[PDB]
Design a binder for this molecule. Structure first.
Ligand code: MG
Ligand code: MG
Ligand code: MG
Ligand code: MG
Ligand code: MG
Ligand code: MG
Ligand code: MG
Ligand code: MG
Ligand code: MG
Ligand code: MG
Ligand code: MG
Ligand code: MG
Ligand code: MG
Ligand code: MG
Ligand code: MG
Ligand code: MG
Ligand code: MG
Ligand code: MG
Ligand code: MG
Ligand code: MG
Ligand code: MG
Ligand code: MG
Ligand code: MG
Ligand code: MG
Ligand code: MG
Ligand code: MG
Ligand code: MG
Ligand code: MG
Ligand code: MG
Ligand code: MG
Ligand code: MG
Ligand code: MG
Ligand code: MG
Ligand code: MG
Ligand code: MG
Ligand code: MG
Ligand code: MG
Ligand code: MG
Ligand code: MG
Ligand code: MG
Ligand code: MG
Ligand code: MG
Ligand code: MG
Ligand code: MG
Ligand code: MG
Lengths: 204, 116, 64, 145
RNA sequence: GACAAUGGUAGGAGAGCGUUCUAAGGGCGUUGAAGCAUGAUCGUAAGGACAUGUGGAGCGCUUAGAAGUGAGAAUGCCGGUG
RNA sequence: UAACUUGGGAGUCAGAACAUGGGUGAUAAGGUCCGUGUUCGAAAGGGAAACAGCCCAGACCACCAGCUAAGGUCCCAAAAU
RNA sequence: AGGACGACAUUAGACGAAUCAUCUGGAAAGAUGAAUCAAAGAAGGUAAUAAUCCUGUAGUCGAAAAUGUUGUCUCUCUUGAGUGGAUCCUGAGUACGACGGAGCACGUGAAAUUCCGUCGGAAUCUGGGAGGACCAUCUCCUAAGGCUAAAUACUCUCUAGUGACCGAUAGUGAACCAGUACCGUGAGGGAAAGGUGAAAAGCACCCCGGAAGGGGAGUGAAAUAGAACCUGAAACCGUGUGCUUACAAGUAGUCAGAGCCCGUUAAUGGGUGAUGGCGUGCCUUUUGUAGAAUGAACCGGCGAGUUACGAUUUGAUGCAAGGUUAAGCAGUAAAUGUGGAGCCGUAGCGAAAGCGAGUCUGAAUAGGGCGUUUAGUAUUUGGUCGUAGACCCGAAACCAGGUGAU
């Protein structure tokens, strides 16, 4: 059982949230794998170098194999040469990988349960924003007594909430479907509407 | 990402060179020959910590021999007599006594002779 | 790319329940006048690929 | 967990070993290859199964058999697996697939006699072992191909 | 507390040092960052501090992640200078 | 106080002297080929003037402590003129 | 083939919120204090690090003219079905065959299916082709004429962006007047080389000198930033000096040690070293190297087991008689949702038909082989292997197309 507050901070009511979603013992191994996986998936991987084939020129043998007194050499673009080709080095590639779906769901539930146990979970009756107003959203956060880093969860895309929170440092807005381990874990507190909480509970 | 050679190389070589302070010419100046010499220095120092114990026992024995001969006794018989007398003073101490107070050493010599 | 099965070995073995490789027997092609009745009778019986050979060849049959 | 306090599961991670980075590693210089020969060379080493010119095993041994173009193989179900359906159930290939007893039907469902049947069922399958049919009948049930 | 082991080439195994970058947290900096230089400093090693001079704007630290991650030798390549 | 089984990873396939049982050679070779042991290889320390392979002996680190091994004790040079 | 009107977009642009004070300092954006905007806290600049100083950003607005994509009118073109089975038509040097080649994953093979050269060469709906030689039956098609968007490939280019990509020996060969200089008859080969300062305020004037160069003075926070002018390591070259050295045999140190000179991260200190003991560099390669075997003049920088996809094993984790999705679609180039086709496992044995906790062999209920009498599977760290140049450098050569008889 969790309190449901109004934007002014008073108790609108109470809500029941399944402990199978918000009440599990977080699985830190799975949560770590999920965080690492998401961070890897964000990488662009656009990095490259020119190996000895790729560097310009270098076709001919710089000097005859024997007789000159110099080390034998086969191309001015060999790797030990200044300006030569790079041995191995970066080559474009993806870093993304997968984990089983059950583990994805377990990771999300573990992050949400960690918030619930750390008392960084606040349930609000609704966001009744008709026009975007960053100042009003800042006041709402202060009245709810929120920390610097807040993840705001709506049931569906809420344009005015998104636009009002967008410019506040440390405030991220998402939907119930858009929840992810990195965002939840980065946040210090979660502010979720009752409808969004019910949707999350259904999904997980 | 690329990791350029950076500063570590110079720091490490400079340490070896500083260890080579006082060596002759290039050996206090050039990393390669300083490194070699510092390697030799370490090996020599390891060996000589052990050789030093031998050398100092040798010195003590020589001095004890001289003192015993001044009392008409060889080192060998003096040590045997001290053993039979049950006196456990080691060679370093015997030498220092013989140097520093001759009357005490003469008393030790008489103990040895009586035991023999 | 995918590793390739060694097709000759695949034509010459079969994998058993415990993962061993059943094999047939050499000296069973011709010149039977030069091998005793007992020799031929017993060469009729299949064997397994030895442990020492398996160390060498196992990757050739990974998909088998 | 916090992003500034991440910790992988114990024993899940190990640092890769890097060769050719000095003698103290124990893999400096020759980088674990020993000295010389074919196996010390970039790209060196013989084909797997090569035996240095001794006739290889898979040439000294002969080929055997053929593959049947019309080969049939059946998805098998044992009686112990049938034991999950309520007595009186009409077990069919569709029910087996839906219940998840059979995943791939292959050439059809064959019932085999491993384990003990503890329920009365009407079993429809493409084939039955003699023992499987006998057990299904003896438990009071029926079977049909 | 006891008492047992600890030479080592190829090679196997383990634990670590340091480099660049990233994430998060927490810091430093024109009242002087990095770099460089010197010193009689500390750690079992790789190595880590501190002070002073130079320098003039950037840089540590913690945990995790990722690698163009460590050179004394290749009649190595380029530069400088004997 | 080991041994064996299974599985992951190897390197090695130029060996040397010495002693001894033998072939070969000439009861030649620091020769050559086998058997057996040790040492070197991969082993520092003490002795054999110097001297991988001989003799003593296997260095975790420190000591300006003691007892010994081979080998030594007139001086070089520790210890018996 | 056109025409009229309209819409949208591209090719310039316009508006666009909100900060002051003190301290340090050459300078404030820094620190301190107190405020303010935010649908704008992207970013760059400004005398150091700025949401509120500038350029901008979110948001909103804008086109005389040209171009592009589109909608509606116009314009243009244009019949559409059924019944009958008498006759007619339905692609010929074609299909096909033989021989010789080629192409099919398929190397001539039992070789279908498909093309080329040479020679031969059909049938006509009761026809013809195909189902991997071939025949029959059945089934599916209807060759020897043509056209056809999209889903797919690629990037010289333009616009807007992105990066656990480089940061001047790197990154393009080229950050710079570089395919330049230079080399070659020619094809062709092919560099080196970035940094004053915030502002040029870029040193008036005096002095030595022919000049170069310098000493002052001045500018500047700094000239010790004065022109390849941020920093300024090492090799190397000099000047001064504390200790030391002209009877001594030296891999240059090490251990012992007086004398002399100092005085530190203040530690049972630092520099030097009369004299004694001990002691033939390093790497490579070797049975064995002080080796008179190899390599390195010195210093600096650069310079060698990587990544992708498969395999296997180990560790980790989730689920478990189950485990797991691929492409695709949605999403922010994300996590993720969805997607069960597919894959592995739950049963083996046999060459196979097949039988099945058994099966194969066997005449055998014998004996024997492989099995049964639970655990897998997905992702991933590590190790190793395979395919790739596969740890790095090095041939003599081979082939192809060009350039040369100055
Ligand atoms: Mg030369
Ligand atoms: Mg390059
Ligand atoms: Mg960098
Ligand atoms: Mg380097
Ligand atoms: Mg036969
Ligand atoms: Mg390691
Ligand atoms: Mg080793
Ligand atoms: Mg080396
Ligand atoms: Mg190895
Ligand atoms: Mg080598
Ligand atoms: Mg060899
Ligand atoms: Mg080898
Ligand atoms: Mg042969
Ligand atoms: Mg050891
Ligand atoms: Mg020992
Ligand atoms: Mg290892
Ligand atoms: Mg490197
Ligand atoms: Mg010999
Ligand atoms: Mg020989
Ligand atoms: Mg022998
Ligand atoms: Mg020895
Ligand atoms: Mg000696
Ligand atoms: Mg004694
Ligand atoms: Mg003497
Ligand atoms: Mg404006
Ligand atoms: Mg403005
Ligand atoms: Mg101000
Ligand atoms: Mg033909
Ligand atoms: Mg046909
Ligand atoms: Mg045909
Ligand atoms: Mg057929
Ligand atoms: Mg098309
Ligand atoms: Mg530079
Ligand atoms: Mg360049
Ligand atoms: Mg260049
Ligand atoms: Mg400069
Ligand atoms: Mg003199
Ligand atoms: Mg060797
Ligand atoms: Mg030799
Ligand atoms: Mg010489
Ligand atoms: Mg050589
Ligand atoms: Mg040389
Ligand atoms: Mg060099
Ligand atoms: Mg490889
Ligand atoms: Mg002419």
């Amino acid at each position: 059982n969790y309190d449901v507050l109004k934007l002014d901070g008073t108790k609108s009511g109470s809500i029941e949230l399944s402990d199978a979603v918000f009440g599990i013992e977080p699985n830190n191994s799975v949560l770590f794998e999920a965080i690492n996986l998401q961070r890897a998936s964000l990488r662009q991987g656009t990095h490259a170098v020119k190996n000895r084939s790729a560097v310009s020129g270098g076709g001919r043998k710089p000097w005859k194999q024997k007789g000159t007194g110099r080390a034998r050499q086969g191309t001015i673009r060999a790797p030990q040469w200044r300006g030569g080709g790079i041995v191995f080095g970066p080559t474009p590639r993806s870093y993304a990988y997968k984990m089983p779906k059950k583990m994805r769901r377990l990771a999300l539930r573990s992050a949400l349960s960690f918030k619930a146990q750390e008392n960084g979970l606040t349930v609000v009756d609704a966001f009744n924003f008709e026009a975007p107003k960053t100042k009003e959203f800042k006041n709402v956060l202060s009245t709810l007594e929120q920390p610097k880093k807040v993840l705001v969860v709506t049931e569906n895309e809420d344009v005015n909430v998104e636009l009002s929170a967008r410019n506040i440092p440390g405030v991220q807005v998402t939907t119930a479907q858009g929840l992810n381990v990195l965002d939840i874990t980065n946040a210090d507190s979660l502010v979720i509407t009752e409808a969004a909480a019910k949707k999350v509970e259904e999904v997980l | 990402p690329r990791v350029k050679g950076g500063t570590v190389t110079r720091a490490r070589r400079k340490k070896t060179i500083k260890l080579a302070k006082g060596y002759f010419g290039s050996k206090h100046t050039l990393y390669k020959v300083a490194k070699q010499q510092v390697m030799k220095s370490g090996q020599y120092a390891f060996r000589d910590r052990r050789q030093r114990k031998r050398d100092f026992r040798k010195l003590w024995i020589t001095r004890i021999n001289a003192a015993a001969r001044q009392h008409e006794m060889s080192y060998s018989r003096l040590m045997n007599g001290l053993k039979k007398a049950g006196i456990d003073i080691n060679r370093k101490m015997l030498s220092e006594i013989a140097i520093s107070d001759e009357k005490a050493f003469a008393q030790l010599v008489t103990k040895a002779k009586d035991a023999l | 790319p995918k590793m390739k099965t060694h097709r000759g070995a695949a034509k010459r073995v079969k994998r058993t329940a415990s993962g061993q490789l059943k094999r047939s027997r050499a000296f069973t092609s011709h010149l039977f006048a030069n091998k005793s009745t007992k020799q031929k009778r017993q060469l009729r019986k299949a064997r397994l690929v030895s442990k020492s050979d398996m160390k060498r060849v196992k990757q050739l049959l990974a998909y088998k | 967990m916090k992003l500034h306090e991440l910790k992988p599961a114990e024993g899940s991670r190990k640092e890769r070993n890097r060769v050719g980075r000095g003698v103290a590693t124990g893999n400096g210089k020759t980088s674990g290859r020993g000295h010389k020969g074919q196996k010390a060379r970039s790209g060196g080493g013989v084909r797997p199964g090569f035996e240095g010119g001794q006739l290889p095993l898979f040439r000294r041994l002969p080929k055997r058999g053929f593959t049947n173009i019309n080969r049939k193989e059946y998805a098998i179900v044992n009686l112990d697996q049938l034991n999950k359906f309520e007595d009186g159930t009409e077990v069919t290939p569709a029910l087996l697939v839906e219940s998840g007893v059979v995943k791939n039907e292959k050439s059809g469902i064959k019932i085999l006699g491993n384990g003990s049947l503890d329920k009365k069922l009407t079993v429809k399958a493409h084939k039955f072992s003699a023992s499987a049919a006998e057990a299904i009948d003896a438990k009071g049930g029926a079977h049909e191909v």
